[PDB]
Amino acid sequence: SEVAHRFKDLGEENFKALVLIAFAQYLQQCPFEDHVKLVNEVTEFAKTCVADESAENCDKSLHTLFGDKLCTVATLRETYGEMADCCAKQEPERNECFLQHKDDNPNLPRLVRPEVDVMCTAFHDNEETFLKKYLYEIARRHPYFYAPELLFFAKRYKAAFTECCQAADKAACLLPKLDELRDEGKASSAKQRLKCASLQKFGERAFKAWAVARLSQRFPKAEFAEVSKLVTDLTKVHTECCHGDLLECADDRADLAKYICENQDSISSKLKECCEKPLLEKSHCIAEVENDEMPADLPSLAADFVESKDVCKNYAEAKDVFLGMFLYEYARRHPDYSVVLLLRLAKTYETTLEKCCAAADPHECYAKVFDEFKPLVEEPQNLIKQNCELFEQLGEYKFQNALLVRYTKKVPQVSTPTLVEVSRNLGKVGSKCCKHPEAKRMPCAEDYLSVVLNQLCVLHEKTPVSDRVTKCCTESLVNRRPCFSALEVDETYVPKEFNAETFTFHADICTLSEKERQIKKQTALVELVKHKPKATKEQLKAVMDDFAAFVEKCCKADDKETCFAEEGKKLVAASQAA
Ligand SMILES: OC[C@H]1O[C@H](O)[C@H](O)[C@@H](O)[C@@H]1O
Q1: Which residues have CB under 6 Å of ligand 1?
Q2: What range defines the domain where residue 563 resides?
Q3: Contacts of 260 (CB under 8 A, 6+ apart)
Q4: 307 and 257 share a domain?
Q5: Do 8 and 91 belong to one domain?
Q6: Ligand 1 pocket: which of 149, 253, 262, 288 to mutate (most atoms <8 Å of CB)?
């Protein structure tokens, strides 16, 4: 009995939370009460199966159990609809139908959070319900969230409410903490979102390589066989999580932590404190842990990978292990290299041996492989230093606007809200990365940009509009950033006529958070660039300043939104001209 097994290992509290997540990610439109009903029914059934593994139905697949349980609700169509596709299917075509229907941008209310007293009132009232509702809302808005890590979020959320609904000042306590969690939430969601796209669109060989690269950077004293074994396990975990199998994913993640913590000596000397932690922190910790120190004596690659004969024989005899090995060996030596870079290098090596070992003088044409690495290392470095340079003059917000123009120019067809979200997360690289010394700049930055471009890739995927986005997103995961880089303003694109709509604002702008005000400015800038990509000196900065000044005047005009509408016909015309 699999469900009974997943009960025992996980315990009831984590069991229930995981189950709930699974339902809200499968059916994001569904109200809270229905999923709760479904969870308790599943827990109730699972308990009997721990009571007797021969009890009727306990032998069935988690998929069948969850699917059946789901279909008692999904079939109601003019309310749901296309999940009544899936309900008329049988396993395993149904599970895939559920997965294939995940929505990275579902038309759901953005959650405004109410005032603190009320929130604290809700927590003390029934704190189990409050937590469940927290999971419910995040999971359905992020159907690919690293489900085990979402438990950890819930844990810290609960700790914020337990502490903060006790002090002198509720809001001063809690609101900062909820913000730090909303910040990490977004990043964590996007991090996992890329892992699932590696697996789903490029297959496990691609993921495995990514893994070897990254774990070798992290665990460089560890031998290749130890790395391979962690890599097999890490992949099994993510493969399960990206596929909706949350239960096994949590269970296999705990096991992976047990394993790692018992073998610290073969692995890294930084695990000390992660391994002292409780179950959830423990995994979270490991995943976040800084690189171990490099083995001080390390021999040059050349001996076994260029100078040697048997290069071609090893290549052919065992290509996957030989290539893993190159990548491990080169990875452990360059924690100052982004993972996308190192996989780029390793693809370059392969292709070279490919063509070279097609024997005329193999030992010759592949003698200068490392020669091809030169340009590949330099392209990122220059862009990183340069964009960090541009950021220092500008700061985060002004750095965001520059990107906004850059990428809207690049791919003008992409929805406005998408551009704004993407460019702002793109600008957030400067804050996270340029702070660092060059030792840490490139991984930080180019790896971060993978995450953010992958966001643009999936958001755009839902309703495709620009052939250059689709092309860069399909082409090759490893190449995505360069692909977007090499792109320049679009000639094909027929500039947008013009809207009075899109440049008249309303008096609600005078009371918005600095955050929301930025987003509104940016939204208008995109729309601007969309109207005039070809032409765009400083003439954009003139227009944006003409907007900001009408906004200064109109927010101090104190009337009933009148100059927003009066000066709102005035200036719409004026900006097409200037
Ligand atoms: O991909 C994230 C993972 O990284 C770590 O190496 C551990 O494998 C795991 O517990 C964590 O989830």
Answers
A1: 234, 253, 256-257, 283, 286-287
A2: 491-568
A3: 230, 267, 271, 275, 286
A4: no
A5: yes
A6: 253
